[PDB]
């Protein structure tokens, strides 16, 4: 029933799964890394912003949840960076006055080259 | 077109020199000279 929804579907479960069969095509051919494992660790936990490092400890320190109030504890930090994320597009960041969101959203400054190297 | 091309650099000269009184002493013969030919031009690119 409505094929203008059963499209992008099919399209999506398609890619994906072809996704997941080259990840196992991969992950038999040439084992997994025992190690590096702790490095991708690190560098997907690096860019989780700050507003969700609360309940991370949280989720270190055993009263995280027992699986439900988490799913309603992480709801208000997506929201608040949400928010905050508006702010910084609208009213800028923290350290940006308007004239520098005039700068930034009118391509006025170049990358800095000379400290590129 | 000698008349006009003098007067052109002779008053972004003058804008120059008024703007920053400091280099207008003669010691800068040859830098605000250096500075009126890089105006007279374009504006002066920055490498980065």
């Given at each position: 029933?409505?094929?203008?929804?059963?499209?992008?579907?099919?399209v999506?479960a398609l890619?994906?799964?072809t996704?997941?069969?080259?990840?196992?095509?991969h992950?038999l051919?040439?084992?997994?890394?025992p190690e590096d494992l702790?490095?991708?660790?690190q560098?997907?936990?690096?860019?989780i912003?700050?507003?969700?490092?609360?309940?991370?400890?949280?989720?270190?320190?055993?009263k995280?949840?027992?699986?439900?109030?988490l799913?309603?504890?992480?709801e208000?930090?997506s929201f608040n960076?949400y928010?905050r994320?508006?702010?910084?597009?609208?009213?800028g960041a923290?350290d940006?006055?308007?004239?520098?969101?005039?700068?930034?959203?009118?391509?006025?400054?170049?990358p800095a080259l000379?400290?590129?190297? | 077109?000698?008349?006009?091309?003098?007067?052109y650099l002779?008053?972004?000269?003058?804008?120059?020199?008024?703007?920053?009184?400091?280099?207008?002493?003669?010691?800068?013969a040859?830098?605000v000279?250096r500075?009126?030919?890089?105006r007279?031009?374009?504006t002066?690119?920055?490498?980065?």
């Amino acid at each position: 029933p409505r094929l203008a929804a059963v499209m992008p579907d099919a399209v999506y479960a398609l890619v994906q799964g072809t996704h997941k069969l080259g990840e196992y095509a991969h992950d038999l051919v040439f084992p997994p890394t025992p190690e590096d494992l702790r490095k991708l660790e690190q560098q997907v936990n690096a860019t989780i912003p700050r507003e969700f490092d609360r309940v991370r400890q949280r989720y270190a320190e055993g009263k995280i949840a027992n699986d439900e109030q988490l799913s309603s504890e992480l709801e208000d930090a997506s929201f608040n960076w949400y928010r905050r994320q508006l702010r910084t597009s609208v009213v800028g960041a923290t350290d940006e006055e308007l004239e520098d969101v005039a700068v930034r959203k009118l391509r006025l400054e170049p990358p800095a080259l000379q400290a590129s190297l | 077109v000698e008349a006009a091309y003098s007067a052109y650099l002779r008053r972004i000269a003058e804008a120059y020199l008024a703007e920053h009184p400091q280099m207008a002493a003669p010691e800068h013969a040859a830098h605000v000279a250096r500075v009126v030919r890089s105006r007279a031009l374009g504006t002066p690119l920055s490498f980065d």
